[PDB]
UniProtKB/Swiss-Prot annotation, chains A, B, D:
Family: Belongs to the vanadium-dependent haloperoxidase family.
Organism the protein comes from: Corallina pilulifera (Red coralline alga)
Chain positions recorded as vanadate binding sites: K399, R407, S484, G485, H486, R546, H552
EC supergroup of this enzyme: oxidoreductase
UniProt protein name: Vanadium-dependent bromoperoxidase
Swiss-Prot record, chain C:
Function: Catalyzes the halogenation of organic substrates in the presence of hydrogen peroxide.
Protein name, as recorded: Vanadium-dependent bromoperoxidase
Region of the whole protein represented: 2 to 100 of 598
Subunit and interaction comment: Homododecamer.
Domain of life: Eukaryota
UniProt family annotation: Belongs to the vanadium-dependent haloperoxidase family.
Curated annotation (Swiss-Prot), chain E:
Record lineage: Eukaryota, Rhodophyta, Florideophyceae, Corallinophycidae, Corallinales
Subunit record text: Homododecamer.
Residues in the signal sequence: none
Native species: Corallina pilulifera
Family from the record: Belongs to the vanadium-dependent haloperoxidase family.
Function: Catalyzes the halogenation of organic substrates in the presence of hydrogen peroxide.
Protein name in UniProt: Vanadium-dependent bromoperoxidase
Residues spanning the membrane: none
Taxonomic superkingdom: Eukaryota
Location of this fragment in the whole protein: 201 to 250 of 598
């Protein structure tokens, strides 16, 4: 007899398809995640005490002493138990914030400001989201981020140095990095970083492969404060997709006839056509020069959960992203996949072709088929948004269940406490001794900046402070530093867009923001940019934006980008079981190779 | 020994969770889909001929004769085979468009206009997406829409009468429905519809339950051109969520202190806060009074695949939705889940509470937990968008594989050809004899209106034409009438939003578009509106927008909203297997009852 | 009692040996294959054109212009589809050779 | 819903394909093999003894007495146990060869020759290879060869008669069978065989179907010493594929142009093009007239395992196969599938088309596809060689585990001992009484031939000897007679080639070896030969070659050919599960019917 | 004329060649290929005979 397949009922075929995808996901196997050893390494310095100090772990919200170390180690140990269980009552049983006033019920803060506002505590943000399963993609716990840099490492000295330089450069305009007015500060930044071992010496044979891949070399004006994804170091700083508008309704080609929209100029003035309405690319403007958490007492109340959310002030109006601070503001409130949805919308309105290895992409006289639900605009619009929560579950597992890395504000608090005490002949937080010894010039600049901030805040004669100035009043979100929610969603989302569109398409005209007015001008850049490169640049924009705000380190961002790429690849592989058609997605990965799915 | 369950590895628990959800979906069972019987009922009227005419079936793209009937029945029978097969080569072998010129290779059209433009053909949009499986939700084929109205039915005469009245009323302003200057037309519309059996007589015991559910009664100024979802018929015609902006960045409560955004007024000028940038509610303005496909030759060219997409003219600028035509323009280009994502963003910025039966919703002093990834803003933002393509797969199965119902333009074609022939004492398309007999007054107004259009278009002395005027140059999309892509996505998306938010929350101040100016005014409505009621209204606004453009009937829209609700409910049920927490979604259904999931 | 294994018929032992070897091969797992990225990197140099050139890809057999670049990108895209499908009729529908 | 298949991962599909082939092989079921009863039938003739004699079983290597019967029956019974177990130690524990000298450790032989050479013992050659499984094809034990002829049967009298006639005809030239010089011997052979019941009387109703199929009728010059596969009895004795060379490099057709190789004449001088080098068809030349094991003492040392391998002498040079002895030499050293690989190579070089029911066999302008890996030269070259070890495992099971039939040399030893003793008024080996009684004329010829051989060997006055003269010094290989390794590989290999090529192609020019020179001449044969017939002839050449050497009987060969055919058919059926293409192999079987696989 | 750099793909490091000489000109890198004569004994010698 002649060998055959057999049919079954549609219901059974749907069931078997879903089981086959689960089985594909299972057969990938799993890998363990490894932490850096700090959690139990560092100890309480008190004689007659057998406790870890937990100073290099995320403890925001747990009650801290006057130096920013936690008071009761059981408070952190209980927090870890609650993270791994997820039980609601166990979370409600934890200790949050400082001691309370018997009569009002209010938390007693250290600062005059927090007390005058009568601030309450804010809580941890999905501390057990790493336990949730999902109907599609790699399980949250099946994949890994490598060990975070340690406080004593050359890597961390370079990372925190970079963040202080960003904080002090917040009022610099992107289009003015090369201007004589900025020459003194910019060159100080470049010289300071090139003075650090991480940047001035290469990796050694036998170093961890992950460290080798993320290590950076010579700092230039062309790479200052940039990422390392391919495309990011080429051309102007900001991706086209965060400043330009799009083609508008009424511009169209109908047979041999060209129609021009009456609103065509909106394209070059920051308006994305959004169906039949618009999106404006102009960001709200945070008070220039105003930074937060530069006073130790305010800083400590924040570390004890004082809810400063919403305390910022703003100038009237809006403007295309202009300064380093404006990018921090952009990533303060963005709605999840916002940046990538907006890039997707620009790409559709401008008629950039989809990946040519999908079906039905030919002229319709040839294939008799147009695209929408599958292989078209609706398909890409669902996929770019859907991968986001899957990427987030994975990064929550790393954040809370594995690494619990302290945010940069807390590293600056150790540095400041360490430096102040050393000046009076004492040692506190010897773990950051290298940073204090090496970053002398930068910290003196921070000290001067912070004195000015504390005076404007109402303190005529402030204690010296070497704290890292924050763009936001509340500083970091209420969850650990490693990895990043913003950068994981960025990795996932741009992976989808590179794969779905013909990502090799070249950009025709390159723009940047004008030096003198709030408008777009033609860039003088002479090379060629591609859609894929500008998508990568966009991912690196949103991710470094968090760093410029003072809430992530370089390593958090890069390693999260790679994690999100893995989640998105996995979802595409599982979904491929559901189509009858003959096709694949061509994906140029962050490492410069291509996978066909 | 004491009864127990046991642990297994994380990877196996994930696999088992996915199979369990596939099993829950399989255990729902499946139901068949029944068509109305027209496809093989209507016959070619020539004697010595043995073919179905297919005149009540979607045939856009197949070659038509001078009356709008397909020339070769095998062209349709082959289209049906390719739909059920999905094979790309079988699709490319279909006949699309008219005869081509041997030397240029271009289609030869009937109209001077299509030939001067040298138009090519456009093709069917995912004619086999109904075969596609999905990793979550009900399979596309497991659910059904009921049989569509037939051409000889009171329901159909009512439906097509309404669409003409919408087309002739496209320049009527919403804020002026009840106003003296529109009294004559508005009362003509109301009297005409109340003169039809479907509206002036109730259903009879023994009629299909789906007919009883969707039949409408007495037409009034308060229900004219509205939907029937609970909430749609109270208060102003347009949902608050398609005309109002939102609270802006800088308005906040920080402890005992209230801060005010410098841009607070943007809320009442239709700017939605979109992260740190904005969306504007102002729509593009299509040239008032210009309709399309009012000439028989141009109409036939469109039925033969002539690609007129992009041919509309616009005025400068943008305005809040003012006329019926403006709603048509809104739904011509909207990106998928656009209306519902924008409502979601307004609800988030204004701080409307999440469903209180979710976890972690209490003040953090009580529960020690805030929300984002699960049960917060990122969760709802991903959920509202991801349901869209699963709903689109199900409606594609109903569109192409089951019902293949002709679009309203094609019904209009049959009415026009029948009336013109009857004046010469000839009978063509007797199937629409009843609409032709009962809609005399409406059809005389259409003929005058069509003459004025054909004169504008450059015809010095137009033949008489009773065609349904189209808001769009290309008419309907390239896929069947029943059901609707817009309405199915609306049903699914508003289902997610009502379940995730505390949808019982009452709206504070109710707005409307001003009679004199491009701005909002406070409405005189006294009564209370709820979030759930305004979300339903929003779904009805987008769905009836399609009707006002001339591209769907009433029954397409209502039956599609029911189907999209089913899809969203199923996705929520299967996903509930993925969480450790104790919680549910409370969802007020379209039928007035509540399911807890 | 003393632990033991047991005999079965020769035919079943042969069947089981073959499945066991299939299982050993399945339990090795699989790895993906990564290409160098050229195929969609290099573009047609004409302005107002939106195609990959495919110049670094094997195109022997598809029609070439006077410089050795393929004339019609759809000829290559169809070749790639037929490769992944294997269907004999799809292969016979490709364009092979000049006019 | 519409009935469907579903996809799974490539890995699972490969696994399921391999399991499905195993299941196909299992569902064939199995059959038992039946032996002829001799093993326990014949008894020791000693009074006061209850032992089988095992005289009709293979016992080569076990110590024999002066009449060639085994000394200790436990030695054979242990050998049988070792065969069915395969355990290495159990095999090492067996008794091999005669008694040994306490000082040197050397075996003490009967003959002066074996002692002067200091010969050691040789061992059994894979006595348990019938226990090994395989990843593809029918299991070794699932199939059967029927009972071997018994010593008392008319069949065996005819078989051993034939072998003595071959041995005495070793210096006859194939091209001279019909010559007056050879008339006396050739006619003696034909008359002697036609005098035997097997050949002169047909089978009877009720005889075993296997016997009916292999029974031979009237002996003629045209069928003398030939096989019975279809094609073998037509045209010259030797297959074209064992004498002709092939088309050579540089002979080619390029469009409308014919190129001629400078080496074109090599074709007709026995050179097969072997890639870019050559194979010569000229065989080494064994000393004409020199035969072995014609002295009882030498014969007995061989039966006791005396390793005479490599003792032959040769004339210098090489020549196309010329005499019956040259064919014996050919099959003394051939490398497994050698003959069939060489035929395959001739067929490829000469451009014989593949089976037209495979894919892609049309002109490339029609199918856009050439062949190599699948359905081409590489495919056939792997398949023709791969089936050989699978065929061998099956024949080892029959040889060792089932039948243990004695080789022809041992039958001649019984005949000689029987005849010598009868002349002195005694009875030994009454089992061969019929052979001795009937073969009088042939044995007297053997006696004269053997006297001459023993004189040339250095014995001036030799004892009379009626032994069967051997072509090889060692006689048979160290494994039983039924079936044959050579003939099973032949059956398997030519089955592959008939199926893979268009086996109905007719041969254009027929050649044979020249009567007077070492060269090829055109045959005067007037009919038509096909590729399939000449492939069958080749199988029968190699198989009868073993008989001409003195090491197999007719029945061994034919029944092994049928066994190999079954193994090759089974492998093709299991492999057919692995292809996506639509095709089959057309196979003309040995029985004259065709199977499509 | 230059070695691989730390961080290059491992497959590149494995296959990169160094200084070209008369002894390695046009040869492979499998162990054994770069010692003795260019052609393998097995493509030029015959064998022991019958
Ligand atoms: Ca197309
Ligand atoms: Ca809470
Ligand atoms: Ca071919």
């Amino acid at each position: 007899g002649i060998p055959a397949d057999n049919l079954q009922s549609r219901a059974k075929a749907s069931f078997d398809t879903r089981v086959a995808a689960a089985e594909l996901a299972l057969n990938r196997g799993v890998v363990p995640s490894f932490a850096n050893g700090e959690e139990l390494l560092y100890r309480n310095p008190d004689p007659d005490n057998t406790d870890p100090s937990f100073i290099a772990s995320f403890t925001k919200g747990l009650p801290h002493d006057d130096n920013g170390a936690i008071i009761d180690p059981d408070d952190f140990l209980a927090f870890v138990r609650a993270i791994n269980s997820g039980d609601e009552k166990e979370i409600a049983d934890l200790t949050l914030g400082p001691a309370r006033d018997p009569e009002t019920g209010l938390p007693i803060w250290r600062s005059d400001l927090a007390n005058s506002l009568e601030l309450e505590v804010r809580g941890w943000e999905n501390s057990s989201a790493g336990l949730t399963f999902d109907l599609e993609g790699p399980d949250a716990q099946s994949i890994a981020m490598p060990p975070a840099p340690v406080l004593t490492s050359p890597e961390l000295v370079a990372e925190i140095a970079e963040l202080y330089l960003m904080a002090l450069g917040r009022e610099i305009e992107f289009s003015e990095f090369d201007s004589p007015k900025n020459a003194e500060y910019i060159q100080f930044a470049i010289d300071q970083l090139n003075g650090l071992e991480w940047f001035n010496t290469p990796a050694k044979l036998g170093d961890p492969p992950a460290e080798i891949r993320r290590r950076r070399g010579e700092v230039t004006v062309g790479n200052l404060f940039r990422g390392i994804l391919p495309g990011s170091e080429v051309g102007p700083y900001l991706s086209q997709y965060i400043i330009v508008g799009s083609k508008q309704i009424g511009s169209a080609t109908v047979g041999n006839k060209t129609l021009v929209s009456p609103n065509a100029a909106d394209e070059f003035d920051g308006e994305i056509a959004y169906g039949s309405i618009t999106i404006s690319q102009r960001v709200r403007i945070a008070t220039p020069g105003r930074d937060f958490m530069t006073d130790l007492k305010v800083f400590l109340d924040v570390q004890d959960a004082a809810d400063f959310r919403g305390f910022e002030s703003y100038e009237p109006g809006a403007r295309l992203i202009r300064t380093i601070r404006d990018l921090a503001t952009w990533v303060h409130f963005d709605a999840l996949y916002e940046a990538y949805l907006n890039a997707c919308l620009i790409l559709l309105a401008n008629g950039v072709p989809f990946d040519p290895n999908l079906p039905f992409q030919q002229e319709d006289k040839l294939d008799n088929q147009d695209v929408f639900v599958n292989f078209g605009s609706a398909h890409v619009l669902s996929l770019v948004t859907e991968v986001a929560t899957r990427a987030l579950k994975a990064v929550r597992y790393q954040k809370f269940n594995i690494h619990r890395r302290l945010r940069p504000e807390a590293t600056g608090g150790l540095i400041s406490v360490n430096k102040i005490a050393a000046q009076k002949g004492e040692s506190i937080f010897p773990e950051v001794d290298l940073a204090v010894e090496e970053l002398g010039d930068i910290l003196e600049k921070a000290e001067i900046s912070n004195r000015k901030q504390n005076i404007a805040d109402g303190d005529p004669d402030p204690d010296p402070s070497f704290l890292l100035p924050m763009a936001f009043a509340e500083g970091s979100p209420f969850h650990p530093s490693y990895g990043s929610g913003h950068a994981v969603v960025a990795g996932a989302c741009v992976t989808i867009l590179k794969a779905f569109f013909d990502s090799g398409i070249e950009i025709d005209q390159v723009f940047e923001v004008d030096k003198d007015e709030d408008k777009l001008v033609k860039s003088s850049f002479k090379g060629t940019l591609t859609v894929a490169g500008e998508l990568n640049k966009l991912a690196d924009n949103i991710a470094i934006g968090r760093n410029m705000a003072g809430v992530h380190y370089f390593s958090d961002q890069f390693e999260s980008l790679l994690l999100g790429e893995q989640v998105a690849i996995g979802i595409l592989e599982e979904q491929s079981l559901t189509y009858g058609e003959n096709f694949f997605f061509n994906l140029p990965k962050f490492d410069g190779t291509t996978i066909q799915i």
